[PDB]
């Protein structure tokens, strides 16, 4: 599957969400927009939410394979995550998820 992201390249940020990352880094998506820009976050301290495109990062689960052989866009609708301007529209909320377990550690 894919519950996290990993940057295979570094990109200079100068936007409102300007997030300076490095090549071959780990980052967890948080928001998404234009299915091109994703608001992820590092696993450091007081980090994120950092912005990261889908052309400079890959979706994975740090488990096995890559994107479980799926497209980032195909992995999006999968969870049916809300947009950035939609999700951020108001934190006050809560998303639910269906119970599903796979037969593979």
């Amino acid at each position: 599957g894919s519950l996290y992201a990993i940057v295979l390249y570094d990109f200079k940020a100068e936007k409102a969400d300007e997030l300076t990352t490095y090549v071959g880094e780990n980052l967890f998506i948080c928001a998404h927009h234009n299915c091109e820009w994703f608001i992820a976050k590092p696993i450091g301290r007081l980090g994120g939410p950092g912005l990261v495109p889908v052309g400079f990062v890959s979706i994975i689960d740090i488990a096995t394979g890559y994107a479980t052989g799926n497209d980032v866009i195909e992995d999006i609708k999968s969870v049916n995550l809300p947009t950035v301007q939609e999700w951020k529209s108001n934190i006050a909320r809560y998303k639910a998820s269906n119970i599903s377990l796979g037969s593979v550690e």
Binding site: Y9, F11, E36, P53, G55, V84, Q85, K88, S89
Partner: peptide
């Protein structure tokens, strides 16, 4: 002709990452 609501919205379009499959 639409505005933005989010604060984490990007300003510029999609960049150009290396080792890609795009021609210029």
């Amino acid at each position: 002709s639409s505005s933005a609501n989010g604060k984490f919205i990007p300003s510029r379009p999609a960049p150009k990452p290396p080792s890609s499959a795009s021609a210029s």
